[PDB]
């Protein structure tokens, strides 16, 4: 056969395993037949071009559908009253009741209401008409085309890059810091000053107007005179109606701090100043490394030079330059870990400090965004650790890493793993024990016997930032502090106004329930890290299979000898962490959603009192809030939430289906499929047809993967339904 053209070992398989494994190994270029390093890098380059094109097409489709089937123009008038519609529904399975139930957007056809916040995002950017969105979609289609053409072109013989080019670290770092990050954020500041702020003040400025419209009455004279403070004079009044000229100012760069009163989002002038500042900082940072001139550093020199003379790190960072440059898996792990941290940061900061107008009052949108980015964060972290393990299996050279930090990590992996295990057990034992103690006492009717620990440390941090709710008087809660006096005339007025009003999510008040759920989160993070770190460090070998690097990253097992060696691979560690990552992100999002739901209804006391025992979560969060969702459709009718109820049950179904692949293993199914093949061959009128691929059971690793995928899809879809439907049915 020639389906897995990249593997004859699969092309010669006489079973369906060939098809399955050709699917699942299509992108492991390194393992493909006759794969050279130049071909590997060039294929990755072209694939990156294709991926960028796909992203551009996806965003273009979003814009096009909001422009065509959307209510953006009638949403920019009363954004706090009109629900934003994502796209129209055309399903030939809908009944008249369903069509009517989904015509909620005042559009006269069934629609979906967007939960992505693109409406608020674009309105803040400066989009006002549907023609603006359509032009954006046209440009993004053009950009997808350009990047597809670039990907095709750079696979041509005279345009294929070389490895001396792919491994050029200094020039790529300089260009990515200076141009991709720095000048890109500078251009975003330019957009925010030339379009977004005038649009937020009711002055339309576009391609036909931006070359004659001054972003500031003084023009660029304050810039080219050193009188930069003239760009902060006359900010927008507190009575500014976003999108209109009533209450607007003339400042383009400010550091007011806090939130705009009407929009309850950060000041656009503050955002513009932020982007300009980080742009110049990144431009400076992108001039650090040596390129075709004499100025700059060399990362190899720095890494080799950094060795503490005490010798507590050994050879320090010698050889890491070659290790990282020659291992794409090391780079992949670093990038994935950093992007995961940054997307968790995006979730956290985007709720505590909303940047888009009126997004804070879109409760379902905020919850959906937070859950989305937290789940993405967890996936990225799991992937980073998985690719670290893959690097250890494939790209690690001990002789090159003779007694540097990496070899030392491997040296004391036992200490690392054992202490990680101890801290996991510590956290788990005691957090679960406190929860059970509270459960039992409250059950016996003695809630006064609960162990409720005030999160005084986090409360102290809040007070240091300027929260006066808790009486600490530390740094910014103190009016006579040097920290207060230093920033009293820049941002502290607005920042204090934001922190000390209970109308926002900035530094929400916390209590013993928050303490307990935080330590549950600590347990989850530590146990996921335990599984992943153990997998990575034992990937090359353990005492059970001391030659694991020979077998690779994702082999099924080593047989029933030596006591049994099920799940003895680093892939299995990934497979096992993914359960735990899902658990932990579930805990995180449960906490976020319940706290915010209680605050939104104003009964924060419900969380403060029921968060201390697990029955409180099971009753006052899940059972209580599932009512509208499970009533999406019922014997007495249906509403728009029927889709979310159906998807809730869908997630339950696929979750339980994954249980099948995770509990039932291969031999049973193989001995059953044998009987099935016998029956087919022996049945008249159906033995006229024969399989071209011998029907076999699924492999061990394949079954683990399929069960994990079903489990994950059920997890995600069940919670997505619950969160969106409950938020939309409660508010």
């Amino acid at each position: 056969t020639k389906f897995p053209k990249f593997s004859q070992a699969l092309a010669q398989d006489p079973a369906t395993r060939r098809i399955w494994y050709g699917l699942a190994t299509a992108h492991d270029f390194e393992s493909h037949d006759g794969m050279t390093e130049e071909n590997l890098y060039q294929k990755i380059f072209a694939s990156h071009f294709g991926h960028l094109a796909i992203i551009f097409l996806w965003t273009s489709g979003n814009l096009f559908h909001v422009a065509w089937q959307g209510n953006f123009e009638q949403w920019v008038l009363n954004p706090l009253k009109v629900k934003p519609v994502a796209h129209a529904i055309w399903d030939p399975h809908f009944g008249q009741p369903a069509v009517k139930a989904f015509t909620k957007g005042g559009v006269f056809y069934p629609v979906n209401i967007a939960t992505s916040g693109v409406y608020h995002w674009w309105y803040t950017i400066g989009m006002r008409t549907n023609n603006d969105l359509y032009a954006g979609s046209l440009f993004l289609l053009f950009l997808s085309g350009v990047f597809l053409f670039a990907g095709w072109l750079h696979l041509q013989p005279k345009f294929r890059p070389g490895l001396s080019w792919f491994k050029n670290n200094e020039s790529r770092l300089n260009h990515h810091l200076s141009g991709l990050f720095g000048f890109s954020s500078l251009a975003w500041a330019g957009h925010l000053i030339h379009i977004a702020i005038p649009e937020a003040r009711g002055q339309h400025v576009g391609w036909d107007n931006f070359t004659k419209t001054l972003p500031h009455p003084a023009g660029l004279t304050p810039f080219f005179t050193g009188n930069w403070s003239l760009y902060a004079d006359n900010p927008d009044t507190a009575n500014h109606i976003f999108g209109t000229s009533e209450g607007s100012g003339s400042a383009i760069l400010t550091f007011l701090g806090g939130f705009h009163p009407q929009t309850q989002a950060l000041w656009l002038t503050d955002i513009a100043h932020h982007h300009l500042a980080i742009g110049v900082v990144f431009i400076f940072a992108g001039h650090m490394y040596r390129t075709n001139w004499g100025i700059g550093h060399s990362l190899k020199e720095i890494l080799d030079a950094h060795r503490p003379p005490g010798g507590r790190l050994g050879a320090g960072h010698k050889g890491l330059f070659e290790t990282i440059t020659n291992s794409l898996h090391f780079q992949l792990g670093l990038a994935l870990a950093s992007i995961g941290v940054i997307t968790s940061l995006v979730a956290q900061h985007m709720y505590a400090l909303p940047a888009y107008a009126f997004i804070a009052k879109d409760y379902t949108t905020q919850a959906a965004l937070y859950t989305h980015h937290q789940y993405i964060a967890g996936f990225l972290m799991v992937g980073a650790f998985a690719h670290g393990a893959i690097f250890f299996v494939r790209d690690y050279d001990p002789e090159q890493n003779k007694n540097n930090v990496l070899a030392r990590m491997l040296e004391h992996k036992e200490a690392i793993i054992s202490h990680l295990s101890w801290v996991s057990l510590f956290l788990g034992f005691h957090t679960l024990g406190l929860y059970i103690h509270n459960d039992v006492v409250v059950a016996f009717g003695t809630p006064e016997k609960q162990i409720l620990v005030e999160p005084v440390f986090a409360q102290w941090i809040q007070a240091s930032s300027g929260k006066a709710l808790y009486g600490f008087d530390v740094l910014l809660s103190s009016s006579n502090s040097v920290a207060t006096n230093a920033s009293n005339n820049i941002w502290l007025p607005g920042w204090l106004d934001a922190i000390n009003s209970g109308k926002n999510s900035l530094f929400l008040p916390i209590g013993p329930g928050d303490f307990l759920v935080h330590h549950a989160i600590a347990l989850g993070l530590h146990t996921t890290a335990l599984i992943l770190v153990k997998g990575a460090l034992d990937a090359r070998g353990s005492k059970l299979m001391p030659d694991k690097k020979d077998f690779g990253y994702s082999f099924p097992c080593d047989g029933p000898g030596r006591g049994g060696t099920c799940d003895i691979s680093a892939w299995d560690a990934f497979y096992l962490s993914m359960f735990w990552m899902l658990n932990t992100i579930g805990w995180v999002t449960f906490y976020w959603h319940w706290k915010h739901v209680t605050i939104w209804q104003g009964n924060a006391g419900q969380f403060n009192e029921s968060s201390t025992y697990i029955m409180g979560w099971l009753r006052d969060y899940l059972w209580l809030n599932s009512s509208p969702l499970i009533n999406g459709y019922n014997p007495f009718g249906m509403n728009s939430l029927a889709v979310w109820a159906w998807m809730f049950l869908f997630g339950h179904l696929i979750w339980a289906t994954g249980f099948m692949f995770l509990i039932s293993w291969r031999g049973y199914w193989q001995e059953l499929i044998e009987t099935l093949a016998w029956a087919h061959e022996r049945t008249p009128l159906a033995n006229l047809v024969r399989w071209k691929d011998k029907p076999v059971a699924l492999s061990i690793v394949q079954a683990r993967l399929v069960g994990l995928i079903h489990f994950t899809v059920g997890y995600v879809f069940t919670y997505a339904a619950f969160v969106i439907a409950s938020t939309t049915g409660k508010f």
Binding site: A67, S137, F149, L155
Partner: peptide, 30 residues
């Protein structure tokens, strides 16, 4: 508000991008 001519221009750009995507897919499959 979005006219059929506009939707048609969008479709033409989509078709061009599809052609380029097929080209890139071929070049990658090699």
């Amino acid at each position: 508000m979005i006219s059929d001519t506009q939707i048609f221009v969008a479709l033409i750009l989509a078709l061009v991008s599809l052609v380029l995507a097929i080209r890139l897919g071929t070049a990658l499959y090699q």
